[PDB]
Amino acid sequence: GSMSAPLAEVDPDIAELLAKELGRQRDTLEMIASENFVPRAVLQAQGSVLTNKYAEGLPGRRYYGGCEHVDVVENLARDRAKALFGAEFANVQPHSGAQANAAVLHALMSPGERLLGLDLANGGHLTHGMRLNFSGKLYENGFYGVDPATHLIDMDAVRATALEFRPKVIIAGWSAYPRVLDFAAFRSIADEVGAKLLVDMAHFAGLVAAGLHPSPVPHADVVSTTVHKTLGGGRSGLIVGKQQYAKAINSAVFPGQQGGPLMHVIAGKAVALKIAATPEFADRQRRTLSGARIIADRLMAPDVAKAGVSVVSGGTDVHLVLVDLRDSPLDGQAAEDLLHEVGITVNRNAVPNDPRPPMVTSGLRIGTPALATRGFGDTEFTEVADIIATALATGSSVDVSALKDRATRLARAFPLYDGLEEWSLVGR
Amino acid sequence: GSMSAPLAEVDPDIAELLAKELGRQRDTLEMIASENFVPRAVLQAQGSVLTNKYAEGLPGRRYYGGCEHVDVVENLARDRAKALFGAEFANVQPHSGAQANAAVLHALMSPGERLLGLDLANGGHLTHGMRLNFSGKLYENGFYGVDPATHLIDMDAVRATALEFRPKVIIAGWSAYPRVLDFAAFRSIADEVGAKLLVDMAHFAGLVAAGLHPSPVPHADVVSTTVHKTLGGGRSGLIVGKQQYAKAINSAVFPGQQGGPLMHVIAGKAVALKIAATPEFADRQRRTLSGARIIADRLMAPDVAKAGVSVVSGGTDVHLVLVDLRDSPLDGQAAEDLLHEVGITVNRNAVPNDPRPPMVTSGLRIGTPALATRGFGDTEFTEVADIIATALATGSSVDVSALKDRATRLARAFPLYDGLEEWSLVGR
Numbered sequence: 001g002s003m004s005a006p007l008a009e010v011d012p013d014i015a016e017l018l019a020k021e022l023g024r025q026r027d028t029l030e031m032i033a034s035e036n037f038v039p040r041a042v043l044q045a046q047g048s049v050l051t052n053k054y055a056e057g058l059p060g061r062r063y064y065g066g067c068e069h070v071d072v073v074e075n076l077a078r079d080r081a082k083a084l085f086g087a088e089f090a091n092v093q094p095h096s097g098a099q100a101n102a103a104v105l106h107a108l109m110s111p112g113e114r115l116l117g118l119d120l121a122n123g124g125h126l127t128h129g130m131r132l133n134f135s136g137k138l139y140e141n142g143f144y145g146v147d148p149a150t151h152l153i154d155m156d157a158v159r160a161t162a163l164e165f166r167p168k169v170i171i172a173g174w175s176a177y178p179r180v181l182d183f184a185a186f187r188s189i190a191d192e193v194g195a196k197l198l199v200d201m202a203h204f205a206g207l208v209a210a211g212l213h214p215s216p217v218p219h220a221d222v223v224s225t226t227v228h229k230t231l232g233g234g235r236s237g238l239i240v241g242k243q244q245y246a247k248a249i250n251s252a253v254f255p256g257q258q259g260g261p262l263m264h265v266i267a268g269k270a271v272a273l274k275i276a277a278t279p280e281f282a283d284r285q286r287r288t289l290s291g292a293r294i295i296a297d298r299l300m301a302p303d304v305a306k307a308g309v310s311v312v313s314g315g316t317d318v319h320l321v322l323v324d325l326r327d328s329p330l331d332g333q334a335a336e337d338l339l340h341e342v343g344i345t346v347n348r349n350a351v352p353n354d355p356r357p358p359m360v361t362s363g364l365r366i367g368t369p370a371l372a373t374r375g376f377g378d379t380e381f382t383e384v385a386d387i388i389a390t391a392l393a394t395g396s397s398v399d400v401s402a403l404k405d406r407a408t409r410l411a412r413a414f415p416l417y418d419g420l421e422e423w424s425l426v427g428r
Numbered sequence: 429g430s431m432s433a434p435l436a437e438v439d440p441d442i443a444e445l446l447a448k449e450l451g452r453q454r455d456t457l458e459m460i461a462s463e464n465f466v467p468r469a470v471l472q473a474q475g476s477v478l479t480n481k482y483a484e485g486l487p488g489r490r491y492y493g494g495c496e497h498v499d500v501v502e503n504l505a506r507d508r509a510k511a512l513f514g515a516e517f518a519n520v521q522p523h524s525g526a527q528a529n530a531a532v533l534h535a536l537m538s539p540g541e542r543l544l545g546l547d548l549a550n551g552g553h554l555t556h557g558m559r560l561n562f563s564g565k566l567y568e569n570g571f572y573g574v575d576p577a578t579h580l581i582d583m584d585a586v587r588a589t590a591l592e593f594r595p596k597v598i599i600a601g602w603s604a605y606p607r608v609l610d611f612a613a614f615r616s617i618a619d620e621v622g623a624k625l626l627v628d629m630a631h632f633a634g635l636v637a638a639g640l641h642p643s644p645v646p647h648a649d650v651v652s653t654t655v656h657k658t659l660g661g662g663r664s665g666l667i668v669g670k671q672q673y674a675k676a677i678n679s680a681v682f683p684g685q686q687g688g689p690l691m692h693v694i695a696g697k698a699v700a701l702k703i704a705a706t707p708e709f710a711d712r713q714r715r716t717l718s719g720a721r722i723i724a725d726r727l728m729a730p731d732v733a734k735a736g737v738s739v740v741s742g743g744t745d746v747h748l749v750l751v752d753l754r755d756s757p758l759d760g761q762a763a764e765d766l767l768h769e770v771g772i773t774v775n776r777n778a779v780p781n782d783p784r785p786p787m788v789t790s791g792l793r794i795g796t797p798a799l800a801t802r803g804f805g806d807t808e809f810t811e812v813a814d815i816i817a818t819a820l821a822t823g824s825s826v827d828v829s830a831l832k833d834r835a836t837r838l839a840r841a842f843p844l845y846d847g848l849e850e851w852s853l854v855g856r
């Protein structure tokens with residue numbers, strides 16, 4: 001019956017929506033900095049029958065019979081994570097970046113203890129202390145920020161905050177920050193005040209894997225990440241860290257926070273970690289970084305600067321560009337909408353001391369990983385940069401038709417998932 | 429290169445383990461009561477490009493652009509969940525059953541407040557108050573159990589416990605209880621002490637959908653569930669409940685507990701909920717219940733009883749049989765391994781006042797949903813029951829090859845995922 005019928009017959013509405021979403025991914029230039037495109041092999045793993053297996057516990061130490069093969073899968077993911085990042089242990093079960101962070105904080109601190117993280121308006125993530133998230137609900141929160149003049153994190157200010165606040169755990173990490181964190185300084189501060197150091201490398205983990213961003217693994221007690229940003233894998237989380245925290249972290253993931261792990265997704269993590277060690281992946285990360293720098297450079301040209309648009313920190317060393325619109329007629333929402341009309345997906349971004357409401361903002365976050373994965377190199381990012389610069393410098397009266405044509409030409413020149421409609425679930 | 433190459437080329441190790449796990453599911457008789465076999469259409473949804481979309485928020489209330497198609501997907505899953513279960517609201521984003529429960533308790537109580545659930549050694553889940561789980565670490569836990577003579581939950585005893593303990597939230601639900609809960613009595617008790625009532629229907633959600641188990645939705649404030657047990661869907665969680673809790677529950681899922689939802693998995697939830705309304709699904713649930721009763725009856729025969737093996741509560745009204753091995757030379761691990769050798773996959777399971785260590789147990793949990801999905805009916809479950817009975821009554825001196833041949837004949841007669849090696853990711 002329906003056990004073997006194709007999706008198109010069982011649920012035509014959902015089949016049609018899958019096709020529409022594939023078409024949307026193909027037709028747009030995706031520049032949300034946290035998004036990417038998974039490889040075919042990760043699609044296959046996530047669509048595998050490993051979803052049927054209950055496998056609570058650890059490899060070879062399960063609460064269920066029949067785990068012999070998913071145990072090898074999980075050990076491959078763990079071993080590849082440790083090897084790729086140079087970490088002493090890995091836990092590959094977190095369902096997401098948020099669940100990775102929930103388990104780390106569960107392992108390292110108790111409710112009521114003090115957590116120090118980067119403020120949301122200064123580029124932090126909601127799991128770094130936002131009051132409606134578990135990180136704010138369970139813990140006493142302190143925050144550091146960026147210098148208002150340079151938009152860099154001032155490590156003397158972070159140190160002064162840590163000395164006053166005496167956190168149990170310091171989080172280094174970000175969702176919207178354009179420069180390299182000083183992990184050695186974070187470790188020195190953590191040691192000085194007796195705090196644990198968590199680095200949440202979700203955004204830049206793929207840059208780390210390719211050797212293009214300093215690694216937090218030498219410095220941090222524990223490192224959390226999403227698998228699905230620059231690392232380029234399926235939507236899920238991952239923890240690595242120093243051996244002395246392995247037992248606490250494993251127990252915090254299960255039974256502390258989760259039940260059964262998603263073994264099909266863990267199989268895809270193993271695939272993504274293997275891909276992340278290849279020269280092809282390293283070149284993709286190189287094109288990600290070069291493309292972001294090309295966009296930042298274009299947006300610092302005099303024509304854009306004279307229009308009241310500026311680049312936060314005067315450049316970038318990562319996979320994104322942060323745009324400051326405080327002196328522009330465009331607010332973040334208006335600029336996001338304008339770029340959507342051209343076919344480019346970005347998101348608005350709060351700037352520190354933002355004069356506009358938090359859902360409007362005076363900033364943009366523009367990311368390059370997804371287009372680099374799609375195949376864009378320096379020539380294509382030069383074109384993308386000029387499209388964005390023309391829109392932002394001119395404003396809402398810009399010739400959108402011409403920019404849309406240019407964006408469509410790029411999308412057509414670099415087909416996405418070409419052949420997916422013929423790929424099989426398993427085999428070749 | 430690697431973006432479009434098949435898994436078999438990118439990662440032969442993982443490709444081979446996918447084949448081995450599929451072979452294992454085909455070759456064994458999978459009788460873990462919390463497992464099932466997802467349909468082809470759910471494999472396709474979970475292997476879809478919807479993994480690439482960040483969609484924090486709710487349909488029509490997203491933080492990022494481009495969600496016009498995943499919004500319809502999520503609305504279909506929500507509307508089908510509400511219609512199938514007769515519920516006033518649904519949140520379809522929980523990553524797992526554990527994450528569904530974490531969000532419910534986040535919404536309904538504060539750290540330090542009192543939680544009353546079924547004791548783990550009496551059939552309850554670790555998210556109902558176990559010391560190392562968030563439900564035990566964040567909250568003050570009380571427990572009710574089963575009557576020692578009948579192994580039934582005594583609602584007079586539950587009421588006495590609630591009157592003395594004064595819980596903020598009462599959980600009704602179980603992972604290893606073989607009888608039907610009295611939801612009217614739980615509601616009466618919750619009202620008497622001013623508690624919220626959460627029903628965790630993870631195990632019996634599919635029985636409820638088919639009309640073969642009383643629904644908790646009329647009585648409960650909120651109902652949590654896994655999608656992947658008797659409901660037969662992809663590995664994930666779901667919450668439904670009364671409309672006055674919709675805002676608190678939605679906020680507790682995001683940004684309370686989670687970040688971005690797994691939209692590919694939510695697409696599969698929509699598919700599974702549609703299948704769960706079909707006559708084919710109801711017949712599968714009917715065969716699940718009849719098969720479990722056949723096994724329970726066979727294991728209460730004198731030859732099994734003489735071997736020190738008994739059936740908890742003297743039968744079953746649900747999809748599982750709980751076997752008590754306290755008077756048997758077999759412990760739970762030994763029986764799990766012996767059944768594995770004859771081709772039947774189960775899990776050991778704790779029993780009240782267990783004389784054996786907790787990782788070993790004095791019990792077995794045997795479930796029929798996966799084999800019912802595979803197509804087994806009363807004739808096949810009669811043979812399964814006799815195989816299990818012979819192994820448990822004879823122990824280590826049983827003719828393993830003779831029993832393994834009988835299990836293999838059943839597996840060969842009911843091919844599993846026949847044709848999967850030819851199915852496509854999308855389309856046919």
Ligand SMILES: Cc1ncc(COP(=O)(O)O)c(CNCC(=O)O)c1O
Pocket residue numbers: 054258259260261462524525526527529553555601602603628629630631654664665
């Ligand atoms: C009753 C009940 N509630 C929650 C869970 C946890 O779901 P998961 O998706 O594993 O996080 C379970 C799972 N119990 C596993 C089992 O019974 O084998 C559950 O039973």
